[PDB]
Amino acid sequence: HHWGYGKHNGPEHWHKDFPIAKGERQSPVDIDTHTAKYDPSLKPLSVSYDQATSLRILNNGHSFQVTFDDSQDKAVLKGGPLDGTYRLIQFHFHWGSLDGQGSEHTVDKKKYAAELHLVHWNTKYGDLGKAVQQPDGLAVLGIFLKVGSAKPGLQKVVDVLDSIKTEGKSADFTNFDPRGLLPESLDYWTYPGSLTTPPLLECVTWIVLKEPISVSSEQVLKFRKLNFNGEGEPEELMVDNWRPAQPLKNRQIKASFK
């Protein structure tokens, strides 16, 4: 029972191998806009992706992922609620079997069509190994996708998906600019949480953007062509690869905007 998203190995089963799944600071959560309170002390987010160097794109059996060279301070995230500078290591997506669902975070219980996660680690903790042991060792920038006009910045990604259809396939993926994946506003919500996949470590400062990016139906249709399965294995279409909202428990969600 390697983990997945189906009836027999999905999010309801994860706690058996990773008991932190019933922990105190699990993600995603629902963001209720009545209770997510504006914090005037929150600094604007600093996203510097201009020197990002992408390495590869891969189907890992739970999503598709684009990886980055994190050997030095090129593509970094800082400011906002964050201490120190955070290096981008990868991004991936979550999406649904139809446009009406797919995002992991929700806003006033509304599910978006997809959710993009840009994963960064805190350099003040030396390496990724020591970072994930710390409550703010990772920062994940979360961005909602809604269906509308095409995002030109997403095109180079979706157009190579046919080359990584099944679990375990990968391809060289150089000179991709993650700047093209961002909405206009960097207005955000932030709270302390976890990885939304095993091992579910409670090491993430979540930064979820208020403004969704719009992507075309054509584009999101390319997401749904991916497989959970390996090459030549019976088809398990990669859709609904999202963990549902987990209990907020004691936590406060802060808004950077009024």
* Stretch near Zn ion under the rule CB under 5 A, chosen from 57-65, 70-78, 143-151, 224-232: 57-65
60 part of the interface to Zn ion, by CB under 5 A: yes
* Stretch near Zn ion under the rule CB under 5 A, chosen from 113-121, 163-171, 214-222, 225-233: 113-121
Pairing status of strand 54-59 against strand 106-107? unpaired
- Considering beta carbons, is residue 60 or 216 the nearer one to Zn ion? 60
Nearest to 182 by CA among 94, 91, 109, 252: 91
Beta strands (DSSP E) in 148-203 are: 170-172, 188-193
Q: Known binding site for Zn(2+): residues? A: 92, 94, 117
Nearest to 224 by CA among 237, 243, 241, 213: 237
CB of 49 to Zn ion, least distance (A): 18
Nearest to 136 by CA among 78, 183, 93: 78
Q: Report the helix count and the strand count for the chain, using DSSP H and E.
A: 3, 15
* Stretch near Zn ion under the rule CB under 5 A, chosen from 13-21, 115-123, 161-169, 200-208: 115-123
Q: Which amino acid is at 18?
A: F
- Considering beta carbons, is residue 116 or 255 the nearer one to Zn ion? 116
CB of 192 to Zn ion, least distance (A): 16
Instruction: Give the position of tokens 């990604």.
Output: 157
> Cβ of 45: how many Cβ atoms within 10 Å?
20
117 part of the interface to Zn ion, by CB under 5 A: yes
The residue with its CB nearest to Zn ion is 117
CB of 147 to Zn ion, least distance (A): 19
List phi, psi (to 5°) of 89: -110, -35
CB of 189 to Zn ion, least distance (A): 16
The two structure tokens encoding residue 214:
């719009």
The two structure tokens encoding residue 163:
């080359």
CB of 171 to Zn ion, least distance (A): 17
Pairing status of strand 106-107 against strand 30-31? parallel
- Considering beta carbons, is residue 39 or 198 the nearer one to Zn ion? 198
Q: Known binding site for substrate: residues? A: 196-197
Active-site annotation, residues: 62
Please give the size of the binding site for Zn ion, defined by CB under 5 A: 2
- Considering beta carbons, is residue 48 or 60 the nearer one to Zn ion? 60
Instruction: Give the position of tokens 């993430």.
Output: 204
* Stretch near Zn ion under the rule CB under 5 A, chosen from 15-23, 71-79, 109-117, 146-154: 109-117
Q: Known binding site: residues? A: 92, 94, 117, 196-197
Q: What single DSSP character describes residue 172?
A: E
Dihedral sign of CA atoms 214, 218, 221, 223 in order: negative
- Considering beta carbons, is residue 39 or 56 the nearer one to Zn ion? 56
Residues of the shown chain interacting with Zn ion in the complex, contacts defined by CB under 5 A: 60, 117
